[PDB]
């Protein structure tokens with residue numbers, strides 16, 4: 360795997376279902392005001408859910424919602440694991456292999 | 462105009478003496494008797510820098526992705 | 528068990544019943 | 556320690572498991588006396604746990620009793636929160652998620668009854684999103700009670716009540732530290748801060764927080780509900796209580812059991828239920844901690860009680876509260892590399908000792924196991940491990956070497972002969 364994008368879907372395009380703009384009212388409701396500025400962890404992942412893997416125009420979209428310069432997103436999606444930047448299948452299966460599982 | 466070495470007169474041109482201080486700096490220009498000039502030493506502001514002010518409630522200084 | 532559909536979980540009882548928030552500002 | 560046990564009765568600190576999963580009046584145990592507790596002065600709860608003095612389940616010492624009556628004594632301008640790990644970082648831990656799976660009604664109380672001591676404002680929990688199904692249900696458990704009016708904003712009978720906001724991670728180790736979790740609760744990348752800013756109770760979300768653990772805030776209400784004088788039951792004058800162990804990797808029926816302190820490993824492993832591998836002649840090479848403690852051979856471990864400071868007597872102690880063992884076929888050198896190959900993937904990567912310093916080992920560990928170039932390396936590889944201690948910020952480095960530090964201890968030859976096994980082979 361490599362962490363650079365070869366201009367796949369700069370304009371995919373992508374958008375959220377108008378059923379989802381009523382939840383993002385609730386998420387931001389969690390946090391205090393003025394620091395809000397990152398709900399990114401659910402909000403960026405909810406977008407994975409609506410789609411099933413998020414292209415680069417998904418990473419650019421939430422920035423327009425969250426007003427953070429979108430290297431403060433492309434970063435967070437390349438740190439964690441659960442998000443899948445490339446495409447996937449209908450079932451993405453795991454085999455735990457570790458000292459006990461070994 | 463044979464190679465491009467830059468040949469020169471001005472037989473001093475390369476000397477740097479090293480003194481220990483100003484009071485004893487000008488000491489050697491007069492005593493040998495030529496004109497001169499002076500610059501001044503510089504050292505920074507005090508200054509005030511504190512990590513741990515980088516995470517702030519109402520302050521405007523709050524870093525991200527450090 | 529519900530693969531998609533976090534909705535009412537997030538937006539039904541939570542949306543109305545998460546008061547206020549005040550949360551202040553932080554304008555900044 | 557008394558009778559060298561650690562028994563298990565129906566008198567324990569956990570109410571029920573197979574009885575009732577859903578909501579209700581907390582038919583017998585829970586939500587019993589509340590308005591009397593909270594209405595009395597808050598510091599009555601503070602130091603009232605000292606009758607027990609819980610060391611804490613966060614994988615360390617530092618009894619939970621101090622840090623809450625610790626700073627966060629005053630209050631000035633800015634709210635205080637609660638962040639209680641639900642996460643599991645250590646391989647084979649598994650103690651967590653059993654508390655939540657069949658009995659969530661306990662912990663929402665555990666905060667509310669607990670949070671009053673902090674004088675806190677809100678309640679955050681945190682859960683690795685890798686548990687989608689079980690973690691999804693807490694919200695119901697929140698609602699199925701909270702909706703009844705049991706919590707917030709006065710509930711019940713006080714002027715102080717506040718709700719709990721679940722969150723989730725993804726590829727986290729982040730519970731691997733406080734002062735990381737409070738960072739990735741925020742939405743930055745998670746690189747844990749420096750430990751002494753202002754340690755974790757000054758620099759925080761916007762404002763002071765305290766990072767608790769699961770059964771540190773789980774068992775607090777029931778230990779403030781009854782307490783005693785039974786709060787100190789088993790274990791010596793130092794460590795006292797009954798925690799949960801979860802056995803894994805060789806047994807008849809590896810499964811959790813509530814067991815009090817100072818229990819020897821030779822009766823405990825064999826019990827609950829059997830020893831199904833060789834109870835002896837299977838060589839019983841054991842790991843006290845989950846990933847945080849190196850091996851013990853057949854020596855005094857089997858008589859060594861599981862009391863904390865009893866383990867510091869051996870070359871390593873364990874706060875993780877887990878057990879992994881081995882018998883015969885498992886090649887330890889083969890079975891410890893995939894404990895190290897794990898570390899290389901879970902590390903932040905800020906610090907120069909951790910990053911670029913763990914791989915130097917992990918790249919060589921695939922020499923020994925395979926069998927490959929000559930000894931005198933072992934003598935160096937020990938020094939590397941001796942060279943990362945005060946040099947890293949978080950504990951993940953201090954938890955990086957011990958497995959290798961304590962492999963070179965306790966087994967000399969198994970390596971020495973294998974480097975020959977390929978040496979004679981080359982010939």
Ligand SMILES: Cc1cc2nc3c(=O)[nH]c(=O)nc-3n(C[C@H](O)[C@H](O)[C@H](O)COP(=O)(O)O)c2cc1C
Nearest residue numbers: 611613640642643644730731732733766767768951
């Ligand atoms: C690799 C690693 C993984 C960890 N995983 C967890 C975890 O899953 N849950 C947890 O509560 N603490 C975990 N910690 C340790 C945190 O320091 C701990 O949660 C925090 O100190 C809270 O301690 P306390 O609430 O018991 O006082 C982990 C530490 C490391 C180094």
Ligand code: SF4
Nearest residue numbers: 902903904905909949
């Ligand atoms: S060890 Fe160094 S790099 Fe790995 S996580 Fe702790 S700090 Fe970040």
